[PDB]
Structure formats: C-alpha cells, structure tokens
Amino acid sequence: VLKIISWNVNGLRAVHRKGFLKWFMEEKPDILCLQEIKAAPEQLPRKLRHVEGYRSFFTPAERKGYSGVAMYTKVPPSSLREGFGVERFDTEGRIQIADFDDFLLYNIYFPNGKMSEERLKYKLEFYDAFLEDVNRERDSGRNVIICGDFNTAHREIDLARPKENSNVSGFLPVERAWIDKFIENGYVDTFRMFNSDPGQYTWWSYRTRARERNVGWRLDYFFVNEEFKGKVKRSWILSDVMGSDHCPIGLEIELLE
Ligand SMILES: [Mn+2]
Numbered sequence: 001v002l003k004i005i006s007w008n009v010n011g012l013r014a015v016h017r018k019g020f021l022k023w024f025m026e027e028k029p030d031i032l033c034l035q036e037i038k039a040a041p042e043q044l045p046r047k048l049r050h051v052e053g054y055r056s057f058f059t060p061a062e063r064k065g066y067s068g069v070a071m072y073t074k075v076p077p078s079s080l081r082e083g084f085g086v087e088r089f090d091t092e093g094r095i096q097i098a099d100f101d102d103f104l105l106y107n108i109y110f111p112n113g114k115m116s117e118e119r120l121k122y123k124l125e126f127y128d129a130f131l132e133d134v135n136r137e138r139d140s141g142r143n144v145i146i147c148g149d150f151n152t153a154h155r156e157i158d159l160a161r162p163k164e165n166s167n168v169s170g171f172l173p174v175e176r177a178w179i180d181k182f183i184e185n186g187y188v189d190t191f192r193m194f195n196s197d198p199g200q201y202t203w204w205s206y207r208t209r210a211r212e213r214n215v216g217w218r219l220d221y222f223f224v225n226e227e228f229k230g231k232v233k234r235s236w237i238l239s240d241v242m243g244s245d246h247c248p249i250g251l252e253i254e255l256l257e
C-alpha cells in the first residue's frame with residue numbers, strides 16, 4: 001500500500017504559516033502532491049524544501065509567486081517530466097509527471113477559466129493537451145494516476161449551487177462535458193468508486209462563511225485508468241484539515257513491482 005495526498009495549498013509559505021509541517025508529519029503519506037505553491041525553491045525556508053525522510057521536486061511558473069506545483073516522495077521517481085511539449089501550457093508551473101515504476105503520477109494544476117474568455121479557451125485546450133498526453137502514455141502500456149485541482153465540478157452533486165453556477169466557469173456545459181469524455185476514454189474518478197453521497201466538496205470560498213455553511217465545490221480529484229482500478233483501496237476527502245481554501249484528498253493503492 002502507497003498513500004498519496006493531493007492538496008491545493010493556496011501558496012506554500014501561506015500554508016506553512018498555518019501548521020503545514022505539523023500536519024504533514026502526523027499524516028506521513030508516501031507521496032504528497034501540491035498545487036499552487038507560489039514560490040521557487042530558492043525563496044523557500046530550507047525546512048520547507050528539505051523535509052526529513054522525503055525527496056522534494058518543484059515546478060515553478062515562469063512568473064514568480066504564481067501557481068506552480070510540488071512533489072514530496074519518500075522514494076524518488078526514476079524521472080520527472082514538467083510539460084506536455086506545448087509551451088503555452090508548459091511554462092505556467094502546472095504539470096509534474098513523475099515516473100515511479102508501477103505507474104506514472106500526474107500532479108496537475110488545471111487552469112481557472114473565470115478570469116476571462118481568453119483563460120477559458122486556455123483551460124479547455126489545456127484539457128485537450130492533457131487528454132492527448134495521458135492517453136498516449138497508457139496506450140503505450142503505462143498505469144496512470146492523475147491528481148490535482150481540475151477547477152471543475154463534474155455533476156450537480158459535486159457542488160452546493162448547480163442552478164446558480166450553470167453559466168459560471170467551473171460548472172459550464174463544455175467543462176463538465178470534457179470530464180464525461182475524459183471518463184469515456186477509460187478513466188475512473190476514484191472518490192466516486194467509494195462514495196456516492198452529496199455535500200462532499202474540496203474547495204470553499206474564503207468569504208461569507210462558505211466552509212462553515214458547506215457551500216463548496218469538488219474541484220480536486222484522483223483519477224486512475226480503468227485497467228488499474230482494482231488496485232485502489234481507498235479514495236477519500238481530508239475535510240478536517242485547515243490551512244487553505246482547499247482541503248487535501250487521499251488515495252491508497254496496492255502493488256509490488
Ligand atoms: Mn488559491
């Protein structure tokens with residue numbers, strides 16, 4: 001068994017100022033994937049970039065203090081890829097694809113579309129390039145795990161306000177339709193393997209008591225390819241965990257090598 005946590009951290013220093021290292025120690029995952037780091041390693045306290053028992057890998061954006069993803073793992077991957085080979089997606093610190101030996105791990109921070117019509121086109125194409133990349137890899141024979149902030153609630157059950165947000169980026173027909181197609185390409189949203197209840201979200205707005213009122217979205221997912229789903233034992237939501245506007249999400253898989 002391998003324990004993997006994904007977490008949009010809303011800035012790595014920001015969360016560190018709120019008990020990140022304590023939490024990380026009590027959870028002891030085998031792999032920790034983080035999104036929205038907002039820093040380069042050289043701007044990070046040394047105790048955030050070197051954690052005992054773990055190996056760190058950082059993928060910052062061209063722009064400083066913007067997005068970027070990180071990976072901590074007890075055992076290091078044989079290599080990391082930091083893009084899809086399409087540069088307008090590869091430079092924003094959004095892609096980490098770590099090759100462990102029993103599987104690939106996609107640590108992805110998918111773009112937000114709310115900003116503008118431009119950023120919507122960008123998010124959707126990012127979705128396409130992503131589909132293309134992941135599909136090439138598993139058709140070639142690789143078992144894949146994809147985690148991270150998709151910035152889209154799949155279904156009505158996956159947010160508190162479907163009706164209100166039918167025309168807001170995050171719950172548009174196009175965006176949810178992409179996830180349907182994603183799943184049609186042979187991929188399973190693992191949480192829904194184990195949990196079919198409503199009121200299960202991973203993000204809440206910092207404003208107007210949204211977390212206390214459970215007015216939230218499920219933006220963070222763990223996907224596996226179909227032919228690998230037998231190996232997943234647990235997919236759950238760490239909703240007690242504070243320190244970001246997202247909470248972390250967990251996966252456990254069984255394998256040898
Ligand atoms: Mn944020």
Ligand SMILES: [Mn+2]
Pocket residue numbers: 008112149151219
């Ligand atoms: Mn987000």
